[PDB]
Design a protein around this ligand. Structure first.
Ligand SMILES: [Zn+2]
Length: 31
């Protein structure tokens, strides 16, 4: 099961779900 960020024009892939969620936090603005 590969993880892919299906955000508006992103398409960045991860092998870890925690990586994907962590990454997603940059879109939502959790910094
Ligand atoms: Zn993304």
């Amino acid at each position: 099961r590969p993880f892919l960020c299906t955000w508006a024009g992103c398409g960045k892939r991860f092998t870890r779900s925690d990586e994907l969620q962590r990454h997603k936090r940059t879109h939502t603005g959790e910094k």
